[PDB]
Amino acid sequence: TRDQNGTWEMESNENFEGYMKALDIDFATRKIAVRLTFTLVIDQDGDNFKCKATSTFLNYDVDFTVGVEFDEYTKSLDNRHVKALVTWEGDVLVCVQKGEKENRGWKKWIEGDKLYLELTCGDQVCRQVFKKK
Numbered sequence: 001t002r003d004q005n006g007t008w009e010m011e012s013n014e015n016f017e018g019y020m021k022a023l024d025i026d027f028a029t030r031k032i033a034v035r036l037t038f039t040l041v042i043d044q045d046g047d048n049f050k051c052k053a054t055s056t057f058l059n060y061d062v063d064f065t066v067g068v069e070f071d072e073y074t075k076s077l078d079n080r081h082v083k084a085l086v087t088w089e090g091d092v093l094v095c096v097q098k099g100e101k102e103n104r105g106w107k108k109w110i111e112g113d114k115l116y117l118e119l120t121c122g123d124q125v126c127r128q129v130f131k132k133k
């Protein structure tokens with residue numbers, strides 16, 4: 001399915017530190033961030049997405065339209081400027097963040113009532129799995 005609407009509670013988190021280290025997140029923010037569980041709230045209407053990931057400390061907010069390139073200032077993460085583009089590869093939602101970092105982006109897909117998120121930077125791949133609340 002291409003329907004990722006929902007409130008999604010973290011079930012698994014693998015190699016979050018490696019991804020954040022690849023982004024050069026400072027040590028203290030990174031060490032706290034690796035410890036924390038996230039809820040992902042995805043508000044999707046056709047091609048229009050609003051994605052909010054919340055923890056007790058760090059936050060992530062992005063709005064986009066599938067297939068429309070946009071400037072992203074990554075800000076609360078690594079404070080960089082990228083040219084972001086979100087598209088479908090089958091039922092996998094693929095984001096490429098064009099900029100200083102290679103292989104930077106993410107992939108989101110549904111596999112049996114679970115939402116998978118892959119965060120990529122360089123040769124680092126973080127895998128997070130969420131359950132629909």
Ligand SMILES: *C/C=C/c1cc2ccc(N(CC)CC)cc2oc1=O
Pocket residue numbers: 033034038040051053054055058059060077106108117
């Ligand atoms: C497609 C959604 C990706 C995504 C990206 C994120 C970046 C940073 C963070 N945090 C804590 C809330 C910083 C450690 C979370 C996050 O969640 C996501 O789903």
